[PDB]
Design a protein around this nucleic acid. Structure first.
Length: 394
RNA sequence: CAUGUGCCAUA
């Protein structure tokens, strides 16, 4: 901090002015200093004359090098967002130029700023506050190669992609959907702790749910077409996704969402069916199996139940009943059946009552749990299944 | 086995 501004105690002189700092050529020293930056933030929220604004704009968002330096600064990035805000609230002559130049600064460094812990905040703030059409030009600056993968899986940049999805029209980021649907890209991105959230955020935005009812018919169709292209890639590789430590969260989201019923059903048929015993024994896939049971249409559910009770290859029911992960599936099956039988769960579909089927499945589980109660009583899951059945009796 | 998975990030 420049000596001219300081005390005999080395503290910023009370009554130091914003104009003083602006006139001194030393704004950059204050802006990267914890204390100076706090001063500057208070100063710029005040009432600024035309000239103070002129200098603020030119010094904070008008010089490329200093702009990037501040945007990638731990304290400075805050001044930059505040100054961008002021600049958008100021409809003076140079309103457009400034905003155009800001777009250009950012665009020329999109990747690095996206990946930067501090500059990614400048990016998110600009996407949200800039006029739509300038914001859309920022989006076009995103890389379309391996760097876009690195962005979607980055701890900082993933929030940029999520912000794009939240505030930018689909027409302008449609490329991202197809980039992600590229089979190899989908794999790398869904199997990542950040990537899997980004993909879910994209799916949610592409879902014809209650948050999309304001869309026009053109917009709904654009949304639907993209949804279909993404889902095609998702369902083609759902086996791989369903068993991954991260991607299983995506498969569960789809399976559990009524607004995506058709994809739920495709996924159940394409990768779960005929694999229930195997998948119910996996750490990650077991949770997807539980979802399937909870949300499957009754027709498929019946095939799922039959697969367990009379499936191929110390029977399947026994394996799952006592397995460390499988017991959570059997419990789910049981709860489903008890709920149905006590009317807590709907048993009718397509104009017909599937109650006798539930009745059959319950019967089977009761008879098995009755015969195995000595072993089941050794386990927490077993105790619970026994008790579920006892409070049914009531 | 009284049992089994994630991310939601800046002064």
């Amino acid at each position: 901090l420049p000596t001219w501004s300081l005390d005999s105690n080395g503290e910023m002189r009370s009554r130091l002015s914003l104009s003083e700092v602006l006139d001194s050529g030393d704004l950059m020293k204050f802006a990267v200093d914890k204390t100076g930056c706090q001063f500057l933030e208070k100063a710029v929220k005040g009432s600024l004359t035309s000239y103070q604004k002129f200098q603020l704009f030119e010094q904070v968002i008008g010089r490329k090098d200093d702009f990037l330096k501040l945007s990638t600064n731990i304290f400075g990035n805050y001044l930059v967002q505040s100054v961008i805000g002021i600049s958008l609230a100021t409809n003076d002559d140079g309103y457009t130029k400034r905003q155009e130049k800001l777009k250009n600064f950012i665009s020329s460094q999109m990747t690095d700023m996206c990946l930067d812990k501090f500059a990614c905040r400048v990016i998110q703030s600009s996407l949200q506050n800039m006029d739509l059409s300038l914001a859309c030009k920022l989006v076009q600056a995103l890389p379309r190669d391996a760097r876009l993968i690195a962005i979607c899986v980055d701890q900082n940049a993933n929030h940029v992609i999520q912000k794009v999805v939240a505030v930018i029209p689909l027409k302008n980021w449609e490329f991202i959907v197809d980039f992600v649907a590229t089979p190899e890209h989908l794999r790398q991105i869904c199997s990542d702790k950040y990537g899997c959230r980004v993909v879910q955020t994209i799916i949610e935005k592409l879902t014809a749910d209650s948050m999309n009812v304001d869309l026009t018919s053109a917009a709904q169709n654009l949304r639907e077409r993209a949804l279909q292209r993404l889902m095609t890639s998702v369902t083609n590789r759902c086996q791989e996704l369903a068993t991954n430590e991260y991607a299983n969260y995506i498969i569960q989201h789809i399976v559990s969402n009524d607004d995506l019923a058709v994809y739920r059903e495709c996924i159940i048929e394409k990768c779960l069916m005929r694999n229930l015993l195997s998948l119910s024994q996996e750490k990650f896939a077991s949770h997807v199996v539980e979802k399937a049971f909870l949300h499957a249409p009754l027709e498929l559910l019946a095939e799922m139940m039959d697969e367990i009770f009379d499936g191929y290859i110390k029977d399947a029911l026994d394996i799952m009943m006592f397995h460390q992960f499988g017991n959570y599936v059997v419990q789910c099956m049981l709860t489903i059946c008890c709920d149905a039988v006590s009317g807590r769960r709907q048993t009718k579909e397509g104009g017909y009552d599937h109650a006798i089927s539930f009745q059959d499945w319950l019967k089977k589980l009761h008879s098995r749990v009755t015969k195995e109660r000595h072993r089941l009583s050794r386990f927490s899951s077993g105790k619970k299944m026994i008790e579920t059945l006892a409070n049914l009796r009531s």
